[PDB]
Design a protein around this nucleic acid. Sequence first.
RNA 1: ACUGGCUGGGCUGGGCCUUUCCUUCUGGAGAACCGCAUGCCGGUGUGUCGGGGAACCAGGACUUUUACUCUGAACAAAUUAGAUCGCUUAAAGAAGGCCUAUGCUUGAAUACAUUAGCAUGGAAUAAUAGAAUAGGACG
RNA 2: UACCUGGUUGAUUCUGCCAGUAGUCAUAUGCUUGUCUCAAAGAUUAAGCCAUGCAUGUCUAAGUAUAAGCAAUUAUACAGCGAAACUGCGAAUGGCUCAUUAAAUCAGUUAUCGUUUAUUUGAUAGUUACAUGGAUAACCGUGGUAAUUCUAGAGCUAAUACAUGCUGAAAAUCCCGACUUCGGAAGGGAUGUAUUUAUUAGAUUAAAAACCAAUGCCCUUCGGGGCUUUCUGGUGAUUCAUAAUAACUUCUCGAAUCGCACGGCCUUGCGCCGGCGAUGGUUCAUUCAAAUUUCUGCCCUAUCAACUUUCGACGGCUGGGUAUUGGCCAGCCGUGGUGACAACGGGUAACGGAGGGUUAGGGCUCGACCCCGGAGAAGGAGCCUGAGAAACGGCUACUACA
RNA 3: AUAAGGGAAGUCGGCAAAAUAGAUCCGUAACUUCGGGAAAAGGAUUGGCUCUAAGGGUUGGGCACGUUGCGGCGUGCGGUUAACAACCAACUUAGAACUGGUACGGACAGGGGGAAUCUGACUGUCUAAUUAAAACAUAGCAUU
Lengths: 201, 261, 150
Amino acid sequence: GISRDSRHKRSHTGAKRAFYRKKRAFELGRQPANTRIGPKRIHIVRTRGGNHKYRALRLDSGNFAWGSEGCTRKTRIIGVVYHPSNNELVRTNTLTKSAVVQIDAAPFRQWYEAHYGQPLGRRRQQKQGQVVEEVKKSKSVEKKQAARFAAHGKVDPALEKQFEAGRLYAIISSRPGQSGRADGYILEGEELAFYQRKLHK
Amino acid sequence: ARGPKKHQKRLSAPSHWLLDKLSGAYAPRPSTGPHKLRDCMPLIVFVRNRLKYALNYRETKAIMMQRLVKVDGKVRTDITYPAGFMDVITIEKTGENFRLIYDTKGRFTVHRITDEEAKYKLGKVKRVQLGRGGVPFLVTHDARTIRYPDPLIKVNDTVKIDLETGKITDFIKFDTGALAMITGGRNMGRVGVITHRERHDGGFGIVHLKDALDNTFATRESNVFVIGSEKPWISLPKGKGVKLTIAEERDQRRARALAAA
Amino acid sequence: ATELTVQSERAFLKQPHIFLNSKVKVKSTRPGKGGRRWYKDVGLGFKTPKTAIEGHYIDKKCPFTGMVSIRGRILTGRVVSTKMHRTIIIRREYLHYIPKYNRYEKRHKNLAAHVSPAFRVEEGDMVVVGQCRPLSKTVRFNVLRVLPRT
RNA sequence: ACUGGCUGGGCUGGGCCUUUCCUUCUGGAGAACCGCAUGCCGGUGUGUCGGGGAACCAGGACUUUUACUCUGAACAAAUUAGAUCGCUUAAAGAAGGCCUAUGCUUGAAUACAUUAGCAUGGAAUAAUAGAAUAGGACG
RNA sequence: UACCUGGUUGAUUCUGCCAGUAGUCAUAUGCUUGUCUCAAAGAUUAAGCCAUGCAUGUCUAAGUAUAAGCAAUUAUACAGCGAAACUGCGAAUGGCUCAUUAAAUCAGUUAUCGUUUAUUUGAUAGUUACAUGGAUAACCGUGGUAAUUCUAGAGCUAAUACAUGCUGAAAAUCCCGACUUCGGAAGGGAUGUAUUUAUUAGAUUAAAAACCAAUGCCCUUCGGGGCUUUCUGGUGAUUCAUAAUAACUUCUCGAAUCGCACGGCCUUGCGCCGGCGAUGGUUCAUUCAAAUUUCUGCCCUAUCAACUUUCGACGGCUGGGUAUUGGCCAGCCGUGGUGACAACGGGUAACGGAGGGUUAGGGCUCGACCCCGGAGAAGGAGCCUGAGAAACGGCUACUACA
RNA sequence: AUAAGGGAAGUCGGCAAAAUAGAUCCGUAACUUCGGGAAAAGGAUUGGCUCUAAGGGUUGGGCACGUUGCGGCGUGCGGUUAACAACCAACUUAGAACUGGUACGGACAGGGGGAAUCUGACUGUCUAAUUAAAACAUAGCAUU
């Protein structure tokens, strides 16, 4: 099958090498697996030494970690929006490492409400359709919560706007073809300005 | 070549086994174990070729099946078991104990030892580091790993092993003025006192020794084995590794012959 | 070296595992711990140049501020070509001995090495290189020191 | 065959003064030359005594760069040269020997390869570098 | 043993070749042939074609026994030896040959801080239970085809085959907090290991202060004088060894297995405890290794002088794939790389080396062949099982023979 | 205008008809007056639809004074935006996915080719109404 040896190449002086031996059991290659967004589907493969790898064909959710806060929550992926290598990766909605995606922001907002006693990204006040309040069943929590809010600080405006729509930008940092999992982190700071400028221009 | 080898050709066996080039085509091919294949002492070679207790291959394994012979206090039942430096071989039925140690000519020799000395060993340390759970451990030159060692012990030193409970009881630092025995190279079997050591960054440091007769020699660090500060802990064989020249050997040989007869 | 911009590519260039977005500000002397530039010491009596520690360039193959370790032979030669990007060609000369005629003859070989943006290398200068892991089809050495010009 | 001597004549080597002699700091243990009092037949262990570190060991910094030669390390068995033992001699082999032993004892050496690579001493011969628009050395 | 002689002329001295002389672990052939020690042998031309036979199987006290098996008669679950058959392991080692191959194989010398590793050796893992569920082989019996180590449908029964599954401990750490007197607290959850991502620790190695913010405290005459301070391994060199926090997974492992001994307690219950082995099992270390990799070194030829990038030729970046590095592969972007110190191409009656023959010294020539490394099983490609194969006394397809 | 199987067996003679044909990318011999032969010979691609990338123009640039109905000039300087922002405008070239009764220069338009002999060097001209050629002319050479 596919081989990854250097015998078939051409020497650095331009000379053409001659046939040496037949193909070996090692130096083989395998067919690439193109991950897609959809219902979960994974195949097992028996690799060298009796170990195993996990081919991911279709995935829809994975771990994403918030850097500054330090929370990791499982959520779903909406779609692929950018890829530095090839445009066809974006159009097909096929995801690999270092692919910018959009994820659901619901699990992360809820944790912020419980940890800090302040609302995050709520412009539905004009409509006030879903406004609701539940009585807080303690008074020591304000001493605990106000200490946290006054110490850590506030979110920057760039990340706050995304919370209004409910969609957040992230980068896949895993290798789905090898480990069968799509994992990444929420991108923020100077790295946010680089991709946002590139995304729409 | 499509897998691992399982045969050993005669004329390719280690030289220090002293095997005749005739009478067969193959060699014992020592099995895998704690010691390297190149420098090991297969049990069949010791029992049959040196002690001459067993006549041939067939009767060598008849003895082993009865669990008569043991090494380091545990019985071994495979004829091609790799024994090595400092190992203690005990045969209770005949009633003597052996220690494997080089002579001045670079080969293993028979060496009787007393019962009191046959209950301890000593070995060079290979590495020290932290294991799983933060528990410190070290490994010796014969693949013995022991947890919770003395924090003062570092690499290249030697430690005395109980050999009954496998616990360290005292150790010797690796420094100038120690008494050492060489384990590899052309200076195999010599005994000397470390004079000074020179190190080269990038590997292969060398140490300078001095014999009892004011002779001088050098070797790589990987071949020096400290066995004591003074009055070596183990019992050295006859000759103490002094490496007489060829001129003196024939003078002593005839002097010994005429003195006896 | 002369580099116009640090971020001039499709992706975002950054040192791995160097966290850059921390709410609290803490000043520390350690290179990589606080969030500032990371660097190491090669050893073998080789001193880190000043340009490496205070520079802003990003390189994953440089022996300084990089993920390559130097181990093996150390060689010397003279540079003959500097017309690629971050790569140079050095020339080594020696004498081979012919036993029958009891005299020598001249011979030479050509070598390829990786040059970091920390150094500035021109043609006809002597350099010292060190072995590393395969970085390309024909690159297995890394530049370490540039000897002063006459 | 042993021993001493020659103001013995030679060969190889190590110390000082001649304008030259030999980098440097830290630590280790500790001598020589010195007195202190205590004791024998003008020398000495004296002691956690002190003026004191010849040499040595460990660690750091400094030193124009190649060729050449000397000594080491590392590197295969067989083969070549070569030591030992009357297989009835020999080509071979690695064996054997001692009174008599219900035992003792020994051998299986050494040199060579030779190109390339790693250390050490030497500093003749053959190349190379340095202060001239001082961009030079020192405190 | 550092050696020479015959031949041009009527005769002479030279250059110069022809012929003579000796060896060969170097093959053939002719004539002849009593004994002792040792025993090479279808390599050269055809890596051309093959009838017939053999060359790989394996059981201990210890995986599964209702043999209409034998043998005894201490075993009413079984109990001695034990065909057959399931299960486990090996068959990837040996043995043969020299077709291809001119920086390729190979030699001496380095690296793996760039990876996999059956087996051996030494350590090492607290989260119905007096014992869980369905099949199948051997066997009985009924059949098909001229034909093979081809196989059909019907009826029984096992596991160390296959598939499930049980906090027996505390402490400590981190979150939510029912409930106030605002200064801490009822009680609630998580916390072995493997897998994947993000974050934190992993210290230095000369010393003296004086300020702001504000709190463990000792003593105390209440004016306060104040405040000594606990760990941290390794390399020439790392994001190393190791540890902590938030989560994740068609997701692991942490013993429903077997043999010998016949013991000790009292609440005498078909109750509790207890020894030595066999076979397995997660991680680290070791052994036999394997794959890549640094430096230098190969015969003749110029009537072979310029070569490489159609459709990677040299380098940069993001990924894919692999046990891992890598232009090994996919996109985007630069214009490079070797050469008179002989590149590129053509020849080889060419596997490389240790080494053989012949000798003053210097050399010339041979090496298919008992030792080491590489390749192949009529010519090409593809693949299954497995720790390990691109295997041919393993499978699939084409071409040529049969 | 079209024809099964054969494909010049017809005839003085392949006379008439058929076959090839646009554009883009590969490939190309003997011979030679070194300019040619050459479109040599011989191969591949071609619709519809939804997308991506590349090739341009114009106007704006910091202070410090004086004139003027938020500013046009007079200047005195400094700086080279590690090239940003707004607006405007036609076509030409390259690449990917999907789709069909495998079709796509869909009509029109549109070269058959190769190995040789005889003869005139070439372009050019003539028997209007049966002969367009090897005939005439030509540059070059020589003579009076």
